[PDB]
């Protein structure tokens with residue numbers, strides 16, 4: 001049994017020469033040399049079995065990533081676990097090793113307009129596929145966008161993903177939410193469970209703005225402060241957009257606020273390409289019904305040098321704890337010897 005920081009990282013003999021990368025959700029991540037396909041790979045250890053939510057998130061992601069096949073979505077190459085349910089305490093998921101991620105790049109590197117355009121293209125191309133499978137990612141953020149040494153981008157972490165369900169999107173005001181605060185669309189705080197595709201477009205809009213300045217556009221410090229930040233830039237919603245919020249608590253909150261004018265994108269981002277700011281505006285629309293969709297975003301003039309719908313594939317088909325361990329066991333069976 002291999003050890004790393006005095007903890008079992010039980011992946012051999014196929015995977016050897018381990019290095020600590022970091023700490024993920026529910027366990028440790030390492031690189032390792034794959035002795036079959038002669039390359040280093042990423043391996044993440046997952047120890048979810050005592051809890052409903054770790055099991056749920058682990059299973060959702062395994063099911064999604066095994067069904068998906070797309071250049072801009074991280075795949076699962078292998079899954080390592082014990083041969084019996086009784087002996088299975090951990091699962092190791094083996095994935096392409098990626099040099100970096102957009103979070104690390106944004107903290108250390110200025111991005112040329114050409115890199116921003118390419119990164120955005122790849123994000124939307126992966127998102128087109130996800131959405132075509134009727135799946136919502138629901139936690140798009142720079143740390144979930146992996147990049148290799150040649151700037152190929154892959155979307156990862158499908159632990160919070162859901163099948164879209166627009167007919168049950170509605171909820172009350174200030175309803176709790178799980179996904180990462182700075183990338184939450186305004187409607188989450190007002191009247192939305194985050195069950196429509198427009199939730200992911202908001203996040204991508206936030207990511208684009210962050211690529212333009214290396215700083216998050218809406219860095220809220222707590223639940224309702226997130227809405228403070230959004231309205232600070234977009235300004236007060238129009239009567240028409242306010243009329244779409246039927247719930248009185250949410251409507252009246254918005255009516256209580258002093259008038260705020262829109263901050264022009266070209267003043268917030270003076271060196272940005274004007275076409276990038278037109279697309280940013282359309283992704284960061286307050287009203288989710290008026291927000292641009294993924295396939296429209298791909299067709300935007302900013303992305304004209306890459307847009308090719310014939311090369312932007314879609315999915316072939318749409319999509320207690322004891323039973324969840326059995327379901328994770330069954331779902332990983334295809335990777336066992338025989």
Ligand SMILES: [NH3+]CC1CCN(c2ncnc3[nH]ccc23)CC1
Nearest residue numbers: 029042095096097098101143144
């Ligand atoms: N949220 C970003 C982290 C970076 C570390 N870590 C990885 N590091 C290298 N290559 C990888 N491939 C798949 C995952 C991964 C897990 C995700």
